[PDB]
Each structure stands twice: as C-alpha cells, then as structure tokens.
Amino acid sequence: MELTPDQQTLLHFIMDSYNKQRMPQEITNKILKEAFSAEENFLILTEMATNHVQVLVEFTKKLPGFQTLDHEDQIALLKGSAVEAMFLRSAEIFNKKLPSGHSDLLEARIRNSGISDEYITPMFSFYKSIGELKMTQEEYALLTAIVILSPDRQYIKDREAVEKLQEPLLDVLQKLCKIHQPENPQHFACLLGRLTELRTFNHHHAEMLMSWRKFTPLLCEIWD
C-alpha cells in the first residue's frame, strides 16, 4: 500500500505550505509576560486570531488548484472556513507546538479572558478529543485543506470546481489511514468526526460575538 506519484506530489505541496506556518515569538512572549487580567488575556487571544487569519490565507493560496477557482469563490471559501480552520490550528498549537507550561498559561488566560463557559467547555473538549487521535502533521495539513476546500459554503457560484479539488485530498487522507493505521479500520471515520465537530464551532462562535459590547472590529468583519 503506497501513494501514487501524483498523490505524493499533491501531498508534498500541502506539507510544504503547511510547514511554513509559525506563530511569532512576540505572541508567545506575551503569554508568558503580560498581566493576568481579562483585558490583557483577551488582547493576546485577539492577537492570536489575527495572526491565524494571515497564516490561513498564505496556506490557502498555495493549495493546488486554489488559484484556478473563480476569484469571488476564493473569498467565499476563505470566509466560509476561517472559524473552523482557526480552531483546528489552535488545537495543534495547544497540543503540539506550545511548551507544556506555555499551554497551561494560555489555558489559564483563555479561562480568564471574560469568555462564557458556554464556549470555553466545547473548545477544551474538542482539544482533548483531537489530542486523543495522536494526529500526524500530514493529517493536520490534509484535514485543514479539506476544511478550506469545502464545497458546501454559502455564496459559492461553482461547487463542482471546488469538489474537484477536495475529493483527491480526502482520497489521499483515507489512503494514509490505510497505510499508517492498518490495524485500526475506523481511523479515517475518527478524523471525519472532527470535521462535524469543527462545524458546531461556527454556531458557538457566532452567538459568542453577539454577547460582546471585548468588541474587535477587524475580527467581526472576517467572522460576520
């Protein structure tokens, strides 16, 4: 069981754009240095969300075939997927990229950033659920690309063109599950379970912003 030279190429382009991404040291230092107040904790989270939006657009621009889509469809996909793509990356930073103590301070800041437990509880629940899968870098990269190249987002004028880009990634992901987890046939199904769980965050996120009066005009323009 192996990827074909074509699937190897498609995967390599995805892994390359994905491995470029890095959270700046200036943000990481703030988690460690700033005062532990709702004001400062919320500001760090705001700086994290803004940086993820920049990282997201750079990753997306390099997905094979993305530049070949109608221009307004590129915007519609980016707008449709930004919230889901954020939570997925944040799960990776929280469970893999951040030192144990740093993620502990980050969590501390998250739980003391004036945000309701209504939103905090499913967030950490999802982080624990994702961490349980012991996801490889290829699975994070593919899963992120599949979330972005989702053909059922609103205001997309040509869905078949997006379907043509998404199907080979799910095919690559399923083959990687067969190759690396042959004893675990439901591994692929587990990964799909995260796509549905990520979608719930679109609603959680939308209602959360309505309980703001915490108002960040830049992020609200992206989100709604």
Binding site: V53, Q54, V57, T60, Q74, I75, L78, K79, E221, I222
Partner: peptide, 13 residues
C-alpha cells in the same frame, strides 16, 4: 460582501 482585509491578503504578491 466587501471583506477588504481578506481581499488584500489574497491578492498580495
């Protein structure tokens, strides 16, 4: 509909 920031980020170099 305007989404100015996403437009700049996408259409940049």
């Amino acid at each position: 509909k305007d989404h100015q920031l996403l437009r700049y980020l996408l259409d940049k170099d």
